[PDB]
Every structure is written in C-alpha cells, then in structure tokens.
Design a binder for this molecule. Structure first.
Ligand SMILES: CC(C)=CCC/C(C)=C/CC/C=C/COP(=O)(O)OP(=O)(O)O
Ligand SMILES: [Mg+2]
Ligand SMILES: [Mg+2]
Ligand SMILES: [Mg+2]
Lengths: 135, 321
C-alpha cells in the first residue's frame, strides 16, 4: 500500500462514516498496481483512482441501489476535481477531464455494437481510459 | 432594460453551451441537447456575468465561467430526476424517460466533464478551490437529504444546511467566481458573494412553500411532493410548532410515524395542516434572507449594474414581496 492509497482510503472511510448513503466499492486491483508505478504526484494518483472508480460504479447502478450509487459516483467525481485544484494541476486536469468526456462517449457507443473484436477493443479502451495518457 | 444589457452575453453563452455539448457519441449529443433545449432561465450565468460587471474589466474568462456553471447545474438535474423518479421538467420529459437510465447517468457525467473542460483554461487555484468545494458540498447536502427522508425530527439548523448546499452555494459560487474573473475588491466581493448566498436561501424557502401552496400546474408535479417523498421542510416544521402552541401535537405524531408506505390520506392531512399553519412563518423567514440580500446590494457602489441585480431580486422573490 502506497502513500496515495492511504490518503484516499482515509478520506473515503470518513465519508462512509459520516454519510450513510455513500457506498464505496472496491478499487480495481489491476488499475491500482499500475497507478502505483505512475510518475506523477500523490494528488494526481488520488484523482485518477477517484474518477476511475466513479465511472466503474456507473455499471453497477440498479433501481435498488440508485439513491446510493448515483450520488456516490458524484462525490468521487467531485473528489477527483478537489485533488487537482490546490495546487492547480492544469495539464493533468485538461487530460483527465477529457478522459471523463471520452469514456462516457465510448460507453454509449458500446451499447450499440455486437461485433466481437470491436467489443474487446472498446472495452480495452474504456478499462484503461485514465491510465493510458500516462504511458 | 436589464435583458438588454445581458442580451449579447446570454446568446453568447447559449451558443457556447451548444458548442460544449457537441459529441461524436450519438445518444449523448441527443440527450445533452434534450435537456439544454428544455426551458432554462439561465439565472446562474446571469449572476456570473453581472458579478463580473461590478468593476471596469474585460475577460474571456467571465463568459466562460457562466457557461460552466450552467453545465454543472444541468448535470445535477439529469442525475436528480433519475434519483427522484421525476418524469417531467418544466413540461419536458426527463432524460431517463426520453432515453434510459444508462444514458441519464452518462450524460450527467458528460456535462460535468465538459463543464470542467471549459474552465480548465483558467490557471487559478483559488478559482478551482472554490468551485470544487461547492460541488463537494452539494453532494454532501444530497447525502444528508437522502438520509433525512422519513426521519423526524429535522432540526432548523439541519434544514438551513440542507437548502444551503442544494441551492444557495451554487448561486453563491456564481457571484463569487464571477467576481474573481474580474479582479473585484474584497469589500465589493464580500457583498455580492453574500447577496448570492442570501438570494438562494430565500428562493429555496419559496420553492418549499410552493410545494404546498401551488397547484400541479405551476409545479408540474402533485401538491405536497416533498413530504410524499419523506422530505421534511420548514413549512411543515413551522406548522407543527404552531399547532403545539394551540396544544395540538397530532401533526407531530403523524409526521414522526410517517413512512415510505404511508397512505395518501395521511399526506392530504399533512398538506392542509401546512397550508393553514406553516405558510406565513415560512414567508417571514424567506423575507429575512431577502431583506439581508438587499442590504448587501445597498452596500456596494452605486452603479448601473446595481439596478439590474435589484430588479432580479424583485422578480425572483415576488412570491414573498
Ligand atoms: C453531478 C453533480 C454536478 C452533482 C450531483 C449532485 C446532485 C444530483 C444534486 C442535485 C441538485 C439539487 C437540485 C434540487 O433538488 P430537488 O429538491 O429534487 O429539486 P426539484 O424538486 O426541482 O427536483
Ligand atoms: Mg433531489
Ligand atoms: Mg428532483
Ligand atoms: Mg422542491
């Protein structure tokens, strides 16, 4: 466990402890191991993990967990923005906010495609959305 | 004459609002357009712009700050209507109905993405500190509201907190970020900042009042929607206190035992008790915030822009004045 992981897990555990309607699903294990070795600040790693988990929670949203999950993806987005604001990481912000825009685009188009190879490729692009710009 | 001064800007931000939503994704472009086409008083850009016009200055940042606020405001609405199960918006169908749940959630995040893209230009920590702080706070307010559903009592402090985060602060940010993107002085920034906060407070009380007083025509949804979804608001709180003064605490008992599975008869009872006992104190409270906003308007330097803000203050709070 790195320093940045302690930081975000501390802040998320505080949220679950304060707001009962915040639900924190597990971070993607593969994306954690990669982020661990990224050449960026502690703050940028937190934003990355925050926004990545935010979007992944998108897929789990039912009618049974929506008044929990929808808002929870929104603080995670707000946290992402909070992590890059003091000091302002302008370049990382422009990059990752673009990633947020593009990952929602790829998920829509994903809903309207059945082709095998095109599914494997777009999923790949969606799964690695927030870490590719840093490799 | 105030819709003349902001006329060239409102159409400019509108043009850029449609620019910001352009997408190579089919549904998202349609969905973003769908809500962007739906009414919109654009009241938040109006505060951004007017706040920046308090001192002599010109920035491209000003009008693009307004564009971002609208995008965030609308991002919250798409998500809201899906959480609250609402199917209507000012007479237009909500995105999760017109499309589906997945599109609704995606487009919300998409709008937030572009809104943040739009202001990523502005190289300023304070700016982003303020903006990111209010967005977090809005979420926090929503969490609290969801946990407060069908949970009585709700303290007066907790109610003020609730309406602050869900309406007041985003508008306060509009006046604050607008003042920043114009390098306005601390004395004048404080007053317009507190004007935005107080106007938003007053307006949200009025909204809560209308949930009880108005009809489904001006609401677009059943009268007493807030309480039917478990939301305890100041009008209900005030009504309960008044009846206890007349030694009648039956309303209190009913609200305390209120549940998500409660019968409509119990809600109809609650509604009428609120109409009879809770309206006037709620108006009184709303007026306090309105008058406080007036004071902050009166303390800033006399100018043309001051008159436009004052005329917006009369329009938005007409129901109480
Ligand atoms: C994604 C983002 C930027 C923020 C997420 C947090 C969200 C969804 C905030 C919703 C904003 C509140 C609207 C009013 O709520 P109401 O009382 O339900 O208002 P009405 O009755 O008009 O729906
Ligand atoms: Mg709501
Ligand atoms: Mg709603
Ligand atoms: Mg309402």
């Amino acid at each position: 466990m790195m320093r940045y992981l302690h930081k975000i897990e501390l802040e998320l555990n505080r949220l679950t402890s304060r707001y009962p309607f915040f639900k924190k699903i597990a971070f993607d294990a593969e994306i954690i191991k990669l982020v661990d070795d990224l050449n960026v600040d502690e703050n940028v790693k937190c934003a990355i993990v925050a926004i990545d988990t935010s979007m992944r929670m998108q897929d789990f949203i039912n009618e049974d967990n929506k008044d929990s999950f929808v808002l929870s993806t929104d603080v995670l987005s707000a946290l992402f923005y909070k992590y890059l604001s003091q000091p302002f990481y302008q370049h990382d912000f422009l990059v990752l906010t673009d990633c947020v825009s593009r990952i929602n685009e790829l998920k829509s188009i994903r809903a309207t495609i059945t082709d095998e190879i095109a599914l494997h490729n777009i999923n790949k692009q969606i799964h690695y959305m927030f870490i590719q710009p840093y490799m | 004459s105030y819709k003349a001064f902001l006329n060239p800007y409102i159409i400019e931000v509108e043009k850029r609002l449609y620019e910001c939503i352009q997408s190579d994704s089919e549904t998202i472009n349609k969905a973003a357009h769908h809500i962007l086409s739906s009414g919109g008083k654009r009241v938040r850009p109006m505060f951004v712009l007017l706040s920046g016009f308090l001192n002599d200055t010109q920035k491209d940042d000003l009008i693009r700050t307004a564009v971002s606020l609208e995008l965030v405001h609308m991002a919250s609405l798409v998500h809201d209507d899906y959480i609250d199960n609402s199917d209507m918006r000012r007479g237009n169908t909500s995105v999760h109905i017109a499309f589906d749940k997945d599109t609704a959630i995606r487009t919300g995040h998409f709008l937030l993405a572009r809104a943040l893209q739009n202001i990523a230009t502005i190289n300023n920590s304070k700016f982003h500190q303020i903006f990111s702080k209010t967005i977090l706070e809005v979420c926090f307010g929503e969490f609290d509201q969801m946990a407060d559903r069908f949970n009585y009592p709700v303290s007066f402090t907790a109610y003020l907190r609730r309406i602050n985060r869900k309406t007041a602060i985003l508008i306060e940010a509009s006046c604050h970020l607008g003042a920043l993107s114009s390098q306005l002085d601390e004395q004048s920034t404080y007053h317009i900042k507190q004007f935005g906060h107080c106007i938003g407070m007053s307006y949200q009380i009025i909204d809560d009042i209308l949930d009880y007083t108005s009809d489904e025509a001006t609401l677009g949804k059943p009268v007493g929607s807030d309480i039917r979804n478990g939301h305890i608001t100041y009008p209900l709180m005030a009504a309960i206190a008044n009846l206890k003064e007349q030694d009648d605490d039956k309303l209190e008992a009913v609200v305390k035992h209120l549940t998500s599975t409660s019968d409509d008869e119990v809600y109809q009872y609650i509604v009428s008790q609120v109409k009879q006992y809770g309206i006037e104190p709620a108006e009184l409270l709303s007026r306090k915030y309105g008058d406080k906003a007036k004071y902050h308007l009166s303390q800033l330097q006399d100018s043309n822009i001051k008159d436009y803000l004052e005329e917006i203050h009369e329009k938005m709070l007409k129901r109480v004045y």
